[PDB]
Amino acid sequence: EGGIILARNLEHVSSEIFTQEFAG
Amino acid sequence: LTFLQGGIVVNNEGGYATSVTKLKLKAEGGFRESGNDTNTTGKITLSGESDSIP
Amino acid sequence: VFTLEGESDWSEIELKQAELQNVNLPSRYFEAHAELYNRKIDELGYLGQTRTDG
Amino acid sequence: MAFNNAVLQEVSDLPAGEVIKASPHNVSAFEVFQNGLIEGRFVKFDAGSIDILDASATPTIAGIAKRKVTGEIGPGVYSTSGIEIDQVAEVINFGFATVTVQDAAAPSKYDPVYAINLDSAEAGKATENSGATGALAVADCVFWEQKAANVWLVRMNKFL
Amino acid sequence: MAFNNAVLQEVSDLPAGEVIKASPHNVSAFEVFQNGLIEGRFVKFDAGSIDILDASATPTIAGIAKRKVTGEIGPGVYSTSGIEIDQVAEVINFGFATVTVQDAAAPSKYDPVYAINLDSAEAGKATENSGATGALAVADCVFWEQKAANVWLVRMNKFL
Numbered sequence: 001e002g003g004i005i006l007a008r009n010l011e012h013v014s015s016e017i018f019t020q021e022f023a024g
Numbered sequence: 025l026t027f028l029q030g031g032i033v034v035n036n037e038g039g040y041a042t043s044v045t046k047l048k049l050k051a052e053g054g055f056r057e058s059g060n061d062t063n064t065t066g067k068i069t070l071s072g073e074s075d076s077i078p
Numbered sequence: 079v080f081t082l083e084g085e086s087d088w089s090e091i092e093l094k095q096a097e098l099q100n101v102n103l104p105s106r107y108f109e110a111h112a113e114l115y116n117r118k119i120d121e122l123g124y125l126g127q128t129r130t131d132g
Numbered sequence: 133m134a135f136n137n138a139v140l141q142e143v144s145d146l147p148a149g150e151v152i153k154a155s156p157h158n159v160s161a162f163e164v165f166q167n168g169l170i171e172g173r174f175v176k177f178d179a180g181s182i183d184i185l186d187a188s189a190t191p192t193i194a195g196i197a198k199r200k201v202t203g204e205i206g207p208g209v210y211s212t213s214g215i216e217i218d219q220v221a222e223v224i225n226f227g228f229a230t231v232t233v234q235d236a237a238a239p240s241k242y243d244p245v246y247a248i249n250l251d252s253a254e255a256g257k258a259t260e261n262s263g264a265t266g267a268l269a270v271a272d273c274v275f276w277e278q279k280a281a282n283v284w285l286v287r288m289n290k291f292l
Numbered sequence: 293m294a295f296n297n298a299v300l301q302e303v304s305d306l307p308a309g310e311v312i313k314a315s316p317h318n319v320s321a322f323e324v325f326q327n328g329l330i331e332g333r334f335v336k337f338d339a340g341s342i343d344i345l346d347a348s349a350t351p352t353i354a355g356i357a358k359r360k361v362t363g364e365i366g367p368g369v370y371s372t373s374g375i376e377i378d379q380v381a382e383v384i385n386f387g388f389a390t391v392t393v394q395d396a397a398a399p400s401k402y403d404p405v406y407a408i409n410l411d412s413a414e415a416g417k418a419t420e421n422s423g424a425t426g427a428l429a430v431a432d433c434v435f436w437e438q439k440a441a442n443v444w445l446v447r448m449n450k451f452l
Binding site for chain 1: 147171199200201202203204205206207208209215216
């Protein structure tokens with residue numbers, strides 16, 4: 001039934017973290 | 025104290041996460057009677073399910 | 079000469095929950111403190127200090 | 133809650149929406165489809181999209197919604213726009229494939245398959261009884277053998 | 293014309309008479325044919341020979357004439373008695389195959405395939421228009437997807 005892979009493992013949360021940027 | 029003497033193992037794997045999710049894989053299918061040179065109509069495959077405890 | 083002082087606090091719980099995302103929450107607060115100091119130094123030389131009451 | 137069915141009496145056979153690849157077989161990818169497309173069911177082709185059987189004039193049965201082994205754990209469902217997004221609808225249109233059957237149905241080998249054509253949960257379920265409500269004669273397809281509980285491996289003689 | 297389409301902003305898509313091997317396919321060699329058999333076209337079996345469709349009434353349509361990819365540069369034509377001689381008329385008769393579509397035809401997926409049963413260069417060309425002149429239904433054959441200019445992947449469901 002359905003599948004074998006848990007949903008959250010079908011998503012790769014990127015290791016690169018993007019900091020918020022503000023005016024110069 | 026009687027719990028841990030009952031035999032229930034203590035599992036220190038959950039880390040610091042707010043919930044632990046366990047997943048179970050079941051083999052579903054069946055072997056079918058075959059001849060020397062035929063096409064098998066029985067297939068072994070996998071299915072799964074999950075549970076979560078906070 | 080006037081002084082500006084700002085705090086930042088966390089807990090071991092949220093420290094480790096942030097480490098779950100490979101985020102160093104203490105280091106991230108230190109970077110944020112340095113960045114806000116730079117931004118305030120930039121703003122004080124352009125718009126000066128606005129008092130908290132407007 | 134806990135894992136369902138701690139101990140099963142017998143090893144369940146093939147789940148619905150599965151295709152045996154020993155025999156000649158074709159599963160063909162359709163990119164556009166309907167959200168909530170139940171796997172292991174007959175699926176129709178309408179307006180250039182693979183969607184669930186529902187009461188219509190004479191739906192174009194395009195085959196059996198293939199169950200993805202490496203899909204999201206959960207109900208057999210094809211999803212769009214989620215963490216469980218399924219890019220294409222994998223549909224089995226040739227060969228031996230497993231389809232759910234109506235719980236009332238008691239089919240047998242070489243019986244003409246009938247799909248269910250209703251706007252209900254029973255949409256796309258197979259059956260032998262032709263007097264069943266919304267029984268649509270699927271062209272050139274026969275029940276082959278009972279795989280699982282309420283799941284039958286049928287044979288599509290030609291492409292669907 | 294000299295090297296039509298000097299530069300293309302996209303790679304040309306699949307030509308006709310080309311069968312995809314990813315699915316259950318069959319191209320079956322017929323050792324006798326007619327001179328002037330166009331590759332990527334519906335051929336017919338008559339009097340023990342493969343030949344281009346003509347004014348006949350109820351031709352037994354073999355299938356798409358396979359395009360000999362390492363045949364002759366030029367028109368996709370089978371030819372006897374030349375340096376451009378093809379010994380056997382290999383003919384695609386099962387599965388997904390590309391056929392030239394009539395220049396005026398606008399088909400879509402799962403549309404029944406009608407072949408132009410005419411005596412012309414438009415013989416054997418596939419069209420969705422039943423009302424078109426000199427066309428007969430190629431039963432158990434549907435359109436799948438527009439590959440190239442006036443070329444479509446169709447599906448021969450049974451051995452054609």
